[PDB]
C-alpha cells in the first residue's frame, strides 16, 4: 500500500511520479488550493509560474479554448497535442510548464463544477510527458525538496 | 479508457464494480453529496439506510470509534474486521450495509477535513467484500436501475 501524497513532504525512489501526479490533479481538481498540502504538492504547485510564462494567462486560454463549454476538455487536449507538435526539442522544463498549465486549467473546471474533468489532465500528461521525462521531473523535485530542507534549517 | 461514474446513469457488464466504488468514495469523500450525481451513485447512496439499520447511527459510531481522532481510521478498520468475523453467514445485504456504513463514515472525515482518509473505505471494502459479493452487488444495482425506471 502506497502513501497518500496530499500531505506528503518527501519524494523517495519508491514513490511513483505518475501516481503523485494522479493524486495531485485529483486533490487540486476536487478540493482546490485552500487546503493543507505537503512539501511535495507545494513544489508541484510552483509549476504554475512556469506555465503562465510559457503558454500564457489562464484568462486567455479560458477564452481561446472555451474551457467551460461542452467541448472544453476536447479543446484542451487538442491544444496540448498542438503544443507537443510545435515545440522543436522538448525539455523537462516544457513538461514542467505543461503540468503547471494543467493545474491552472483544472482550477477553471473545479470552479465551474465540472468535477470529472480533472481526468483530462492525466490524459494530457500521458500524451505530453513520457517515462523518461517523468524521471527527470522526479529528479528535479527531489533536488528542490532537498534545498527546501536546507532553507528550513 | 473507462467512463467517469460521478454522473453515470448506467451499470453495464463492462463496468467494473470495484472501480465504481473507488470513484464513489473519492467523490463523496472529497466533494460530498451537495453535488450532481448520476443514477448509479444515487442508488449506492441509498445503501446509507441499510447501514444505519444494521450497524447503528453515525453519531454513535463516531463517538464509539472516535473517528476524527488520530487513531480514527485504524479503529474503523478494526471495527470492520470485528463485524466481519462476527457475522455467521455473510449475505450481499451485509456487504451493502457495510458500503453504506463506509459512506457515512467518509462524510465524518470530509467534514473534519481528513481528506486522505477516504482511502480507508477502499481498504475496508477489500477486507469485507470478496469478488463473489461484488458481483452480487453489481447484479442488484443493475436490477435496481430498472426497478427505479418502473416507478
UniProtKB/Swiss-Prot annotation, chain A:
Claim: Phosphoprotein is one of the keywords in the record: no
Family: Belongs to the orthopoxvirus A52R protein family.
Name of the molecule in the record: Protein A52
Originating organism: Vaccinia virus (strain Western Reserve)
GO molecular function, one term: protein sequestering activity
Residues of the full protein shown: 40 to 190 of 190
Role of this protein: Bcl-2-like protein which targets host toll-like receptor signaling complexes to suppress innate immune response. Interacts with host TRAF6 to activate p38 and subsequently induce the expression of several cytokines such as IL-10. Also associates with host IRAK2 to inhibit NF-kappa-B signaling.
GO cellular component, one term: host cell cytoplasm
Biological processes, Gene Ontology terms: symbiont-mediated suppression of host innate immune response; symbiont-mediated suppression of host NF-kappaB cascade; symbiont-mediated suppression of host TRAF-mediated signal transduction
KW RNA-binding (keyword) present: no
Signal peptide: none
Keywords of this entry: Host-virus interaction, Inhibition of host innate immune response by virus, Inhibition of host NF-kappa-B by virus, Inhibition of host RLR pathway by virus, Inhibition of host TRAFs by virus, Viral immunoevasion
Self-association state and partner proteins as the record states: Interacts with host TRAF6 and IRAK2.
Amino acid at each position: 500500500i502506497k502513501p497518500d501524497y496530499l500531505e506528503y513532504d518527501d519524494l523517495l525512489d519508491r514513490d511513483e511520479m505518475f501516481t503523485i501526479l494522479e493524486e495531485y490533479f485529483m486533490y487540486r481538481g476536487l478540493l482546490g488550493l485552500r487546503i493543507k498540502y505537503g512539501r511535495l504538492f507545494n513544489e508541484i504547485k510552483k509549476f504554475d509560474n512556469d506555465a503562465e510564462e510559457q503558454f500564457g494567462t489562464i484568462e486567455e486560454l479560458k477564452q481561446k479554448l472555451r474551457l467551460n463549454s461542452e467541448e472544453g476538455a476536447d479543446n484542451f487536449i487538442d491544444y496540448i497535442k498542438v503544443q507537443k507538435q510545435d515545440i522543436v526539442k522538448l525539455t523537462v522544463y516544457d513538461c514542467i510548464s505543461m503540468i503547471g498549465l494543467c493545474a491552472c486549467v483544472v482550477d477553471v473546471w473545479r470552479n465551474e463544477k465540472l468535477f470529472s474533468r480533472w481526468k483530462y489532465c492525466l490524459r494530457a500528461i500521458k500524451l505530453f510527458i513520457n517515462d523518461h521525462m517523468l524521471d527527470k521531473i522526479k529528479s528535479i523535485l527531489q533536488n528542490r525538496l532537498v534545498y527546501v530542507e536546507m532553507s528550513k534549517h
